[PDB]
Amino acid sequence: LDKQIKEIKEVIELPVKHPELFEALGIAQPKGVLLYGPPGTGKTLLARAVAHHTDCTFIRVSRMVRELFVMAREHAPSIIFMDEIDSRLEGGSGGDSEVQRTMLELLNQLDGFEATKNIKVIMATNRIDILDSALLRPGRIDRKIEFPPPNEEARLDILKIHSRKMNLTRGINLRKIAELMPGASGAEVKGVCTEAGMYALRERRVHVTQEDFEMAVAKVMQKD
Amino acid sequence: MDIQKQEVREAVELPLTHFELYKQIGIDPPRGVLMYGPPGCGKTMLAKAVAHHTTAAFIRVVGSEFVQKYLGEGPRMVRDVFRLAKENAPAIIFIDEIDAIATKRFDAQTGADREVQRILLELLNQMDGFDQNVNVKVIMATNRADTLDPALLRPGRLDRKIEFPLPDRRQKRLIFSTITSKMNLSEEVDLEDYVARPDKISGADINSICQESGMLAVRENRYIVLAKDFEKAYKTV
Amino acid sequence: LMVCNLAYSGKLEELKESILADKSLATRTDQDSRTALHWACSAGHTEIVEFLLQLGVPVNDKDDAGWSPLHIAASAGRDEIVKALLGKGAQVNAVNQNGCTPLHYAASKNRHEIAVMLLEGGANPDAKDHYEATAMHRAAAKGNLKMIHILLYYKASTNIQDTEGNTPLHLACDEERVEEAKLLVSQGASIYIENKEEKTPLQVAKGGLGLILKRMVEG
Numbered sequence A: 001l002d003k004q005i006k007e008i009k010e011v012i013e014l015p016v017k018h019p020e021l022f023e024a025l026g027i028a029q030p031k032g033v034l035l036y037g038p039p040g041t042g043k044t045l046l047a048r049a050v051a052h053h054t055d056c057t058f059i060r061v062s063r064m065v066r067e068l069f070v071m072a073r074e075h076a077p078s079i080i081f082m083d084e085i086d087s088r089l090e091g092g093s094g095g096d097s098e099v100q101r102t103m104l105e106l107l108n109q110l111d112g113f114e115a116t117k118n119i120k121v122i123m124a125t126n127r128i129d130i131l132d133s134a135l136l137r138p139g140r141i142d143r144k145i146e147f148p149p150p151n152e153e154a155r156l157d158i159l160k161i162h163s164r165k166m167n168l169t170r171g172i173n174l175r176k177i178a179e180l181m182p183g184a185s186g187a188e189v190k191g192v193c194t195e196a197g198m199y200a201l202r203e204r205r206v207h208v209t210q211e212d213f214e215m216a217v218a219k220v221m222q223k224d
Numbered sequence B: 001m002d003i004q005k006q007e008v009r010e011a012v013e014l015p016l017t018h019f020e021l022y023k024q025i026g027i028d029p030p031r032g033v034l035m036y037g038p039p040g041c042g043k044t045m046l047a048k049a050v051a052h053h054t055t056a057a058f059i060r061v062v063g064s065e066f067v068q069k070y071l072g073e074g075p076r077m078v079r080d081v082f083r084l085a086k087e088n089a090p091a092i093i094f095i096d097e098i099d100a101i102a103t104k105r106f107d108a109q110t111g112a113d114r115e116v117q118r119i120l121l122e123l124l125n126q127m128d129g130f131d132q133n134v135n136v137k138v139i140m141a142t143n144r145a146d147t148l149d150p151a152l153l154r155p156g157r158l159d160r161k162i163e164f165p166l167p168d169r170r171q172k173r174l175i176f177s178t179i180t181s182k183m184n185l186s187e188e189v190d191l192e193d194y195v196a197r198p199d200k201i202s203g204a205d206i207n208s209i210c211q212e213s214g215m216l217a218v219r220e221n222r223y224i225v226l227a228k229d230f231e232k233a234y235k236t237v
Numbered sequence C: 001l002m003v004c005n006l007a008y009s010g011k012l013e014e015l016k017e018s019i020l021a022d023k024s025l026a027t028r029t030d031q032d033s034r035t036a037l038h039w040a041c042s043a044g045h046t047e048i049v050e051f052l053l054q055l056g057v058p059v060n061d062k063d064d065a066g067w068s069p070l071h072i073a074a075s076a077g078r079d080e081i082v083k084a085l086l087g088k089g090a091q092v093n094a095v096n097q098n099g100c101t102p103l104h105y106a107a108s109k110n111r112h113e114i115a116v117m118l119l120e121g122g123a124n125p126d127a128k129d130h131y132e133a134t135a136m137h138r139a140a141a142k143g144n145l146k147m148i149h150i151l152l153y154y155k156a157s158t159n160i161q162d163t164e165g166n167t168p169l170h171l172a173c174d175e176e177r178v179e180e181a182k183l184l185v186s187q188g189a190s191i192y193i194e195n196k197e198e199k200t201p202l203q204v205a206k207g208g209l210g211l212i213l214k215r216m217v218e219g
Helices: A002-008 A045-054 A067-074 A091-109 A129-136 A153-164 A174-179 A187-194 A197-203 A210-223 B003-016 B045-053 B073-088 B111-129 B169-180 B193-200 B206-216 B227-236 C002-009 C012-021 C036-042 C046-055 C069-076 C079-088 C102-108 C112-121 C135-142 C145-152 C168-174 C178-186 C209-218
Strands: A032-034 A121-123 B032-035 B058-062 B091-096 B136-141
Touching: A002 A045, A002 A153, A153 A174, A153 A187, A174 A210, A187 A197, A187 A210, A197 A210, A197 B003, B003 B032, B003 B045, B003 B136, B045 B058, B058 B073, B073 B091, B073 B111, B073 B136, B169 B193, B169 B206, B193 C135, B206 B227, C002 C012, C002 C036, C012 C046, C036 C046, C036 C069, C046 C079, C069 C079, C069 C102, C069 C112, C079 C112, C102 C112, C102 C135, C112 C145, C135 C145, C135 C168, C145 C178, C168 C178, C178 C209
Parallel strands: A032 A121, B032 B136, B058 B091, B091 B136
Antiparallel strands: none
């Protein structure tokens, strides 16, 4: 995910080294960013990893939708990410329109007036509310970063990060085993590893070979 | 079948018979197993089979075990069970019917249920803190998935969601064989209309229905049970 | 009664001396409308039913529900008892409590000889019960391939609509029987009939088995 972190450095890595001179920087920093696509890798590992490099608090959403907004009002400097909401008018669109009003007043506070510096959040949307939320957000003040499925170059490094945590043989080729993991997104590789450790357990071996990873490839390709 | 017995088998009993392997076999928290399906009886023969395949302690606590006037008895009971579990032996906690104790609430008329669901949040964070070397298993079974709290269904906590099919053909064959194996074997007794009819009219406790059929076949005028007390036992209960 | 123990336990000389001493005991029944023929056929004794049928006991003696002894001999798996009851002229299409026939219960035990003797005497191959289900639904519901095959030796139908609208192919695919589905389809099964749930036999089969079902239909 080198392209995703390279494109997110300006979004999350920007308030890291210079949190105080935002009043001096008059380049109109964007208020939030959205990442649409299969939430394989980038919903928790990216936000908690780059936010773990920021060394700041990480508040999550996880009617009961207003007390967390008051807590977000108290602890304003943080990284808030939508995780539970990412799943004709009617009463259900009025109750949902209460949260639409919550994000409209998040654009009225964030875009209204900067109370405290370092207010940067990340959106998450993958359903019809892409055309509805995008119908209500005509790209006026919003960072548009496209979230593509992880390519092969995004599979070698996510395979390394998701391979260092467990055992690995010294005679495996990451090129072919990375090119032989198709499907939805980067969570499929996590399906190969997490669904391969059970075969390493069943086989009763100290390490994992490339043939076991190929078996997990066949498993995830039969589950897709 | 064998899907549920295999998934609970290798996902449940294989990690149970291994100590401190969690951070060496590809660390994951598949500690929560959730079952579903109102029409299937369940929760009895699976718990018996677990209690026979393994020889350890078992904490059978139906969800309504802490519904009392004392709101503070909850954390004392589940905390004593937690400490005796982590200290004595890796037991298995059977939490049943989470629908009545896993429902959202906004008003304060039912403040007892909100207080015990805040206890459920307390142990919901304790299980997050107990991710390192916890000596207990937490299985779960529910019959309603509409009003469940989103915190339980969040990944990492309940990573096992098994389902029950409406036709329990293999469970009917095993539940009739397990009762006819001890009872007198009649060559007239058929199992095809009694494996095809419960496909339409499905129900629970079929073994208890066979026991009631034996209680109707204890008249001593009929030496072995037959279809009369089978279909009669069906139409009665 | 006492003749229930005599015919149940297989007392030869006690039952012979009991009938020769009191001929009324043969016609006497218990409180469940079950004569000695039902106990000696449920027990599988040959000589006792040869003596009772030798004296000329009515073969169509039905109980309170309607269970004829031919269902007991058919489900009993004893070929000789079927030879005796069919020799005396038993009703091959006797109606029991649930409207079934001895073909369903002879098919339940996977007895080929009983099925050949019953169907040879003039039994209906497409005999439907109260639920409009034939022997192929149950034999396919357990996995009796050769029973369905010997049912196809008499030119039986393979598209009997069940009480829910399920053909024998629906129950064969629901039982996860590949060879049985390929044989029924290869012998004239219909894949276009739908049940009350509006589900085709292709959708009922899991793992992409409908593609090879229709592949064998067109091939």
